[PDB]
């Protein structure tokens, strides 16, 4: 009835359409470096991409957009001292709340 | 930094995508019901759609006559979960062999052999 790795599969098929810019339908550029991604995937980590997609404002770090788009389709998320506070402003404005407590606890300790 | 829920919580998402007309860019009918998905995750799980919308070949038409099966198999690839019976198994089977799908495919022979 239920096969425990259909959704890793659906995700890491999603990654690789995106790492050939397959069926990818929104696009943007953040300081100079273009990103391609799918809109379905964004509105489905992000609820600030859900209302853009929905209905119908944009940061200026790339290097953290990067780890968080990277995030939304691999499930993984390196933070260090030195990214935290540039994916912290990403994922604040996108108001992911799994990327925003996953920092406070890497602030918060180091 | 490893999520482990991560991948299941985008595939609901994606599913309520579907349930309601968000985002999904691909439309057919069979048998007088209307069916919409995301080409991108048709293109995860069936091979038909796969050479459809990635590899950009000239496939042949779609081939699928049973509208309840076809919601299954749907309802498989954005849920996972798949209720096979011996009444429902030859026409998930006759939909997912069409599709190219061997992770059904293989659940109806198992069920057929009991």
Redesign the interface.
Same mark, same amino acid.
């Given at each position: 009835?239920?096969?425990?790795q259909?959704? &890793?599969?659906?995700?890491e098929? !999603?990654n690789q &359409?995106r790492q050939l810019g397959? !069926?990818c339908?929104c696009t943007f550029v953040v300081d100079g470096v273009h990103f391609k991604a799918?809109?379905?995937?964004l509105?489905?980590?992000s609820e600030y991409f859900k209302m853009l997609?929905?209905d119908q404002l944009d940061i200026s770090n790339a290097a953290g957009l990067g780890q968080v788009l990277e995030?939304?389709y691999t499930?993984?998320?390196?933070?260090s001292p030195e990214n935290v506070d540039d994916v912290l402003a990403v994922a604040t404005f996108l108001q992911m709340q799994?990327i925003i407590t996953?920092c406070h606890a890497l602030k918060s300790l180091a």
């Open positions: 009835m239920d096969f425990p259909h959704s &890793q599969h659906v995700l098929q !999603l &359409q397959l !069926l339908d799918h809109k379905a995937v509105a489905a980590c997609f929905v995030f939304m499930a993984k998320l390196s933070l799994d996953a």
